[PDB]
C-alpha cells in the first residue's frame, strides 16, 4: 500500500526488488509529512532564495527572433547556483534525507549537473555523497567531474554497458539496494519508482509557477507554449506542472534525436519506443523486439537515456502535452546561435529545447506566438566538447 497514487494512467509503479520497498515507503511518508510541515517548507524556501538564488530571471530574446512574429522568453535556470535546474529538487531531497536520519547520499549523473547539485547540497547540509557516472560522460562532461571532486564528493566511473547515464542509474540502484538504511538515493530526474516522479515534480514546480507570474507581469497573458527538453523529465515537468490546467497553453517536450531517429541512435522512447518495465517504472522504453533494454545515444549526456518519466508518457497519451525530437546537429546550431546572438552559453540539453523553438519560429515566421523555453542549464560543462566538434568542422 501507498499514501499516494503511484501511477499516471498506466505508467509508473514501483518495480523494484522487494528489499527496496520499505525505503520507498519511508521516502513517500517523509515527503507527505514534509509537504504539511511549515518548518520544512520555510527551510526549503530559505535555501532556494538565499542559497540558490531564486527567483531566476525570465529573459526576452530579441536578436534571435528578429523578422518574425515570435516573442521568445528564456526561463534562466542556467543562473541557479550550480548552473542547472537540478539544484532545486536536490535541496528538497537533501532535506528529506536529513528528515529520515540518513547520513549518506547516492546519486547518478549524466551531464554531471545533478552530480554537482548533489555534491554541493551534501557539502552544505552534512551528507557523505557518492556519485555514479558513466565513463564516457566522465570524459565529455569533465568540468563537472572536477567540480564534484573539489567539493569532496566521491565520483565513481561506470564502465559497464554504454558507460553513460543508464549504466550509472543501474549502479546507483544496485548500491542503494544494499545501503538504504544509511544512504538516501537522490535520484536526479522525474523517473524511477514511485515516489520519485511525484517528489521531483513537486520540488521543481516553482519553475513554471515563476514563469507564469513573470509572463503575466511582462505580457499580461499566458504563453502560447512552454518548451523544454526531456531526458528523464524533471526540468520539463517542473516547467509544465503549473500550466497543466491552463488548457490554452501548449506543453512541448523535446527528446534527443541523436544522429537521427532513423539511425536508432537517439534517446526518444516516448515517441519512438514501446512501453516496458525497467528502472523501477512502467514507461516508454527503447527496447529490442524481444524486450531487452537498448542503449540510447545523444550528443548531450543529460538526455542520453533510453526511457522517460511516467507522467510525460501519460500527458502524451491523453494529448495534453506534445513531444518532438531534435537532432545533435540541430542542437549544436541552437547552441551557437544563443552564444553568438544573445550572449548566453546554454547546456547542450537545453539547446534541444531552444532548437525546437527556433524551428517553430522559422517554419511559420508570420505566426504570432509567445513562447517560453526552459533554459535548464549553462554550457560550461560542454564548451570543450563543443569546441572540439566545431574545430573539426572549421567554425
Amino acid at each position: 500500500t501507498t499514501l499516494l497514487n503511484p501511477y499516471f494512467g498506466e505508467f509508473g509503479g514501483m518495480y523494484v526488488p522487494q528489499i527496496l520497498m520499505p525505503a520507498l515507503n519511508q521516502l513517500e511518508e517523509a515527503f507527505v509529512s514534509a509537504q504539511k510541515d511549515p518548518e520544512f517548507q520555510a527551510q526549503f524556501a530559505d535555501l532556494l532564495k538565499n542559497y540558490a538564488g531564486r527567483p531566476t530571471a525570465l529573459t526576452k530574446c530579441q536578436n534571435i527572433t528578429a523578422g518574425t512574429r515570435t516573442t521568445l522568453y528564456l526561463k534562466r535556470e542556467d543562473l541557479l547556483h550550480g548552473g542547472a535546474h537540478k539544484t532545486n529538487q536536490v535541496l528538497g531531497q537533501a532535506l528529506l534525507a536529513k528528515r529520515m536520519g540518513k547520513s549518506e547520499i547516492i546519486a547518478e549523473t549524466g551531464a554531471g549537473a545533478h552530480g554537482v547539485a548533489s555534491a554541493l547540497a551534501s557539502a552544505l547540509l552534512g551528507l557523505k555523497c557518492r556519485i555514479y557516472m558513466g565513463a564516457k560522460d566522465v570524459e565529455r562532461q569533465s568540468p563537472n567531474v572536477f567540480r564534484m571532486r573539489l567539493m569532496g564528493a566521491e565520483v565513481i566511473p561506470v564502465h559497464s554497458g554504454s558507460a553513460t547515464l543508464k549504466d550509472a542509474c543501474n549502479e546507483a540502484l544496485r548500491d542503494w539496494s544494499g545501503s538504504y538504511e544509511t544512504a538516501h538515493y537522490m535520484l536526479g530526474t522525474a523517473a524511477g519508482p514511485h515516489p520519485y516522479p511525484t517528489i521531483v515534480r513537486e520540488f521543481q514546480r516553482m519553475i513554471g509557477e515563476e514563469t507564469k507570474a513573470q509572463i503575466l507581469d511582462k505580457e499580461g497573458r499566458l504563453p502560447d507554449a512552454v518548451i523544454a527538453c526531456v531526458g528523464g523529465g524533471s526540468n520539463a515537468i517542473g516547467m509544465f506542472a503549473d500550466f497543466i490546467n491552463d488548457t490554452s497553453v501548449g506543453l512541448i517536450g523535446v527528446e534527443p534525436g541523436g544522429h537521427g531517429i532513423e539511425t536508432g541512435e537517439h534517446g526518444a522512447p516516448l515517441k519512438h519506443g514501446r512501453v516496458g518495465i525497467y528502472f523501477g517504472m512502467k514507461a516508454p522504453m527503447m527496447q529490442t523486439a524481444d524486450g531487452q533494454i537498448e542503449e540510447s545515444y545523444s550528443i548531450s549526456a543529460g538526455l542520453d537515456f533510453p526511457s522517460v518519466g511516467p507522467q510525460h508518457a501519460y500527458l502524451n497519451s491523453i494529448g495534453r502535452a506534445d513531444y518532438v525530437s531534435i537532432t545533435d546537429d540541430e542542437a549544436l546550431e541552437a547552441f551557437k546561435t544563443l552564444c553568438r546572438h544573445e550572449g548566453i552559453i546554454p547546456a547542450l540539453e537545453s539547446s534541444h529545447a531552444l532548437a525546437h523553438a527556433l524551428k517553430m519560429m522559422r517554419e511559420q515566421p508570420e505566426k504570432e506566438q509567445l513562447l517560453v523555453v526552459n533554459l535548464s542549464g549553462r554550457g560550461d560543462k560542454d564548451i570543450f566538447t563543443v569546441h572540439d566538434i566545431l574545430k573539426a568542422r572549421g567554425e
Binding site: 523494484v16 526488488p17 543501474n170 539496494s177 544494499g178 518495465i277
Partner: protein, 268 residues
C-alpha cells in the same frame, strides 16, 4: 507447481534439505550450458533456478552480470532459452525448474502469453526479481492460471503484513533473502532468520529456500538447521564457470565436486 510439492515431500521423508543451484541459461554457450546443467543434476541438485539473459539485471552483482554478458556474447535470446528448457525437461521429467526473470521479459509480449509458454515447456515456477508483491497481481494470476508457482521474496526487513501476503500468494517455495544488496558470493548474510522462518510456517507458506551469498557447505547446513527447507547458490556456481572458460572439462569436474559437497551439507 506440483513438482515442488513432490520434492519437498520426498525431502521431508528423508529429513533432507534441498540444494538448488542457479545458473544463467546459455552461459557460456548453449551447448556448454546444457552440459553444465546436466552435471548440476547428476551431482545432486534437487531443483534448478535458471536465469534468462537480460540486458539490465538490477538485482545481480558483477558475477552474474558477467554470466548474462557471456550468454549475450554467444547470441542467446529468450526464444533460445525456451528451446533449452524443452530439452532439459525432456531429459529430466521430475526435477523442479524455476526461472529467474526480470519484468520486461515477462511483460514484453504479454504476461499471459509468457506464462503460457512456461507451461508448454514444463517450467514449474517463475520469480520476477523486480516485481514486489505490491505490483504482483497480473503476474501471480497469470502464473496460477498456467499451473506455474509464483515465487515471492521474503526479505529480512519483512513486516507481518508482508509475511502474510507472501504466505497466501506464493506457491512452490518461499524465497528467504539472506541479506540486503544484490547477488554475490562475496557478501555473506548477517542476521539470523529464525523468526521469519517460523512465522512463514505459522502462515502455511510454501517451504522456504534461503538465497543470496550462499557459497559454502556450512551455509547450506546452517540454513537447514535454522529451519529452512533448503538453500540456493548462484554466484559461487557461476564463479566456477567463469574460472574455467578455457577448460570445459575441468569446469564440469569442479562444478560436480562443488555441487555434491553442497548437496551433502543438506543431508541430516
Amino acid at each position: 507447481m506440483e513438482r515442488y510439492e513432490n520434492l519437498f515431500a520426498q525431502l521431508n521423508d528423508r529429513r533432507e534439505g534441498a540444494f538448488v543451484p542457479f545458473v544463467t541459461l546459455g552461459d557460456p554457450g548453449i551447448e556448454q550450458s546444457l552440459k553444465i546443467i546436466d552435471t548440476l543434476i547428476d551431482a545432486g541438485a534437487d531443483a534448478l533456478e535458471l536465469g534468462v539473459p537480460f540486458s539490465d539485471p538490477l538485482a545481480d552483482g558483477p558475477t552474474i552480470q558477467n554470466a548474462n554478458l557471456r550468454a549475450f556474447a554467444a547470441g542467446v535470446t529468450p526464444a533460445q532459452c525456451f528451446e533449452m528448457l524443452a530439452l532439459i525437461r525432456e531429459k529430466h521429467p521430475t526435477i523442479p525448474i524455476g526461472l529467474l526473470m526480470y519484468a520486461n521479459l515477462v511483460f514484453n509480449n504479454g504476461i499471459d502469453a509468457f506464462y503460457a509458454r512456461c507451461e508448454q515447456v514444463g517450467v514449474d515456477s517463475v520469480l520476477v526479481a523486480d516485481v514486489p508483491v505490491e505490483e504482483s497481481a497480473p503476474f501471480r494470476q497469470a502464473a496460477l492460471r498456467h499451473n506455474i508457482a509464483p515465487i515471492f521474496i521474503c526479505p529480512p526487513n519483512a513486516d507481518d503484513d508482508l509475511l502474510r501476503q507472501v504466505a497466501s500468494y506464493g506457491r512452490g517455495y518461499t524465497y528467504l533473502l539472506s541479506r540486503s544488496g544484490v547477488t554475490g558470493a562475496e557478501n555473506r548474510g548477517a542476521l539470523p532468520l529464525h523468526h521469519l522462518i517460523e512465522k512463514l510456517k505459522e502462515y502455511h507458506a510454501a517451504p522456504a529456500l534461503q538465497g543470496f551469498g550462499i557459497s559454502s557447505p556450512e551455509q547450506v547446513s546452517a540454513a537447514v538447521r535454522a529451519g529452512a527447507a533448503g538453500a540456493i547458490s548462484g554466484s559461487a556456481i557461476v564463479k566456477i564457470i567463469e574460472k574455467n572458460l578455457a577448460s570445459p572439462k575441468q569446469m564440469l569436474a569442479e562444478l560436480r565436486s562443488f555441487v555434491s559437497a553442497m548437496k551433502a551439507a543438506s543431508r541430516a
